[PDB]
Amino acid sequence: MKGPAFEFAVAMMKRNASTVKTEYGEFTMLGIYDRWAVLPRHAKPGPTILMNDQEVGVLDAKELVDKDGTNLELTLLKLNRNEKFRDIRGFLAREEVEVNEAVLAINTSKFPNMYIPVGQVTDYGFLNLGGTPTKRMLVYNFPTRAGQCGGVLMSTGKVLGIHVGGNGHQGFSAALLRHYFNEE
Amino acid sequence: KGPAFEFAVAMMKRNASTVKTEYGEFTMLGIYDRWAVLPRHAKPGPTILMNDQEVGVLDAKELVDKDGTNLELTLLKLNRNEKFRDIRGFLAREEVEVNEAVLAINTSKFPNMYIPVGQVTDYGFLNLGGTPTKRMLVYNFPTRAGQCGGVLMSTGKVLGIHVGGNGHQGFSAALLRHYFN
Ligand SMILES: *[C@@H](CC(=O)OCC)[C@H](C[C@@H]1CCNC1=O)NC(=O)[C@@H](CC(=O)[C@@H](NC(=O)c1cc(C)on1)C(C)C)Cc1ccc(F)cc1
Ligand SMILES: *[C@@H](CC(=O)OCC)[C@H](C[C@@H]1CCNC1=O)NC(=O)[C@@H](CC(=O)[C@@H](NC(=O)c1cc(C)on1)C(C)C)Cc1ccc(F)cc1
Ligand SMILES: [Cl-]
Ligand SMILES: [Mg+2]
Ligand SMILES: [Mg+2]
């Protein structure tokens, strides 16, 4: 609900977010640093994506799992483009973030530049999501809709995670942690 | 953009509802007492569905200027016991222009969504949906069906109500203080 959180969110989406289509559907994508970006794992990007209606090559993809192989529901993508993202790694936490007030930001054809005050975010942990055991889920209560996956969950100076699932009035993000961007 | 969003979220929580008529689903802003506003195109009947509940309409006034020109707003007096928080002090005497506005929507398609639409210009006259219409405010963003009744706001100001557009251009009817007496 906070002004500064929305101010932060809008600036973040303007600088680093895009609309991406894969063979599996349309998503919000967040650039992280250099040419590295993130999508929900179920976006299932191939060797070419559509980024703001433009064909972009994918040079590497990394589907994130924990040390025991459990799904984290995020895929990191290295893009064949010459433009670089603003390095936003400093806005990513070392561990799953909780906040009193978060904003979920969506950038797709269905929801072009929409911001939703989702209220409190709780570190929920384990969830069987779409039939897949998944960890490091953040939960929040708002009226969820199809097409919001990839939405960026934020608060002032904080990128918490990426929207990946939900049902009815409950939404879940995969926590977006800083160490995910280290080879190890 | 921050202060505009903060003002907008509080306004919607307190004064906005979702309304269904034969002509679709709308965001509806309550103004004071039992008086609310809808786009004229909503064409409310003697009853409306407000947050999924049947609510009687006691009076409906389709606003026109002194020469009968469409303003694209209908004021409705609702048969409800609850009074709206009085927000008339946030309404200007004339059409407002700002560098940064937020458009706020609350429907089943767009439940509690806020859009940074940037600059708002007093465009004036427009032939909208075939009807000559005045006091149009214009802003540039990717417009969508189901956003009518959306509340256009800036820091400490309610500017207008979304009534139309096409492609990447949206229009609000200016919400002027004198409309409410
Ligand atoms: C986003 C995907 C999308 O629409 O992109 C365009 C192709 C979508 C968002 C949810 C739909 C309804 N509300 C949402 O927030 N995500 C999905 O559809 C994932 C699957 C789910 O969310 C399931 N939900 C649950 O399992 C669930 C469990 C609980 C307690 O709450 N929800 C569906 C039954 C809706 C996609 C997905 C994610 C991860 C996977 F391993 C497989 C599939
Ligand atoms: C909201 C009402 C609704 O029922 O949802 C759509 C079915 C809707 C919003 C616009 C739809 C697309 N973009 C929008 O912002 N409003 C309308 O559909 C009105 C009609 C229009 O907006 C027309 N647009 C124009 O005439 C126009 C002209 C210019 C320069 O830019 N746009 C349509 C061609 C989209 C409803 C309306 C208003 C007044 C009337 F007299 C009749 C109908
Ligand atoms: Cl009545
Ligand atoms: Mg193909
Ligand atoms: Mg400007």
Automatic annotation (TrEMBL), chain B:
<protein>
    <recommendedName>
        <fullName>Genome polyprotein</fullName>
    </recommendedName>
</protein>
<comment type="subunit">
    <text>Capsid protein VP1: Interacts with capsid protein VP0, and capsid protein VP3 to form heterotrimeric protomers. Five protomers subsequently associate to form pentamers which serve as building blocks for the capsid. Interacts with capsid protein VP2, capsid protein VP3 and capsid protein VP4 following cleavage of capsid protein VP0.</text>
</comment>
<comment type="function">
    <text>Capsid protein VP2: Forms an icosahedral capsid of pseudo T=3 symmetry with capsid proteins VP2 and VP3. The capsid is 300 Angstroms in diameter, composed of 60 copies of each capsid protein and enclosing the viral positive strand RNA genome.</text>
</comment>
<comment type="similarity">
    <text>Belongs to the picornaviruses polyprotein family.</text>
</comment>
<comment type="function">
    <text>Protein 3A: Localizes the viral replication complex to the surface of membranous vesicles. It inhibits host cell endoplasmic reticulum-to-Golgi apparatus transport and causes the disassembly of the Golgi complex, possibly through GBF1 interaction. This would result in depletion of MHC, trail receptors and IFN receptors at the host cell surface.</text>
</comment>
<feature type="binding site">
    <location>
        <position position="100"/>
    </location>
    <ligand>
        <name>Mg(2+)</name>
    </ligand>
</feature>
<feature type="domain" description="Peptidase C3">
    <location>
        <begin position="2"/>
        <end position="180"/>
    </location>
</feature>
<comment type="subunit">
    <text>Interacts with protein 3AB and with RNA-directed RNA polymerase.</text>
</comment>
